[PDB]
Design a protein around this nucleic acid. Structure first.
Ligand SMILES: [K+]
Ligand SMILES: [K+]
Ligand SMILES: [Mg+2]
Ligand SMILES: [Mg+2]
Ligand SMILES: [Mg+2]
Ligand SMILES: [Mg+2]
Length: 92
RNA sequence: AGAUAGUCGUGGGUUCCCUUUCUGGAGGGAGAGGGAAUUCCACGUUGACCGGGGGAACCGGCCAGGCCCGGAAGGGAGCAACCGUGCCCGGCUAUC
């Protein structure tokens, strides 16, 4: 799906950003104790009106295991966005 | 012509896992701190040097392929191979 997003205030989220067992392996923020399922996630994104649209047929290089990828709207910066999602994920 | 043994300190490098600031359409970019290693560099330090050889899938570094993101460039996690080490042989010197 190329780079359009750039023009849509979109940014790509590889699920690993959150649910990687090791940072070197991909996590960019504190580990999430609980375990989180895919659909649950999406859900949360939507919940923050990030209007997630998913992209199948896309393999993270640090684990070709994951074949999909989520497109989301930047809230302020990919960064802020993530914090926000993560922080939200740790919803007790 | 015997037995063994081959300096320690701080700084930094790197690597591993962790926490963290800013950031891009991916691979990612620019920083901060903590801990655990080090086979890697500083000088300073000590009698703690000199050569030789060698090869771990399961050690460390690195990584052809293959598996990936990229428009490409390139960037990645990573197996074999390679390297480095581990090891072995002398001398050299040290304590018995
Ligand atoms: K290897
Ligand atoms: K690499
Ligand atoms: Mg789109
Ligand atoms: Mg490595
Ligand atoms: Mg390759
Ligand atoms: Mg000897």
């Amino acid at each position: 799906s190329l780079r359009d997003l750039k023009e849509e205030n979109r940014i790509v989220i590889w699920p690993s950003y959150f649910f990687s067992p090791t940072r070197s392996k991909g996590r960019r923020l504190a580990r999430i104790p609980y375990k989180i399922k895919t659909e649950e996630l999406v859900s949360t994104l939507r919940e923050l009106g990030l209007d997630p649209i998913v992209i199948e047929n896309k393999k993270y290089p640090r684990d070709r295991k994951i074949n999909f990828l989520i497109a989301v709207k930047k809230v302020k910066s990919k960064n802020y966005t993530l914090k926000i999602i993560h922080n939200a994920l740790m919803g007790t």
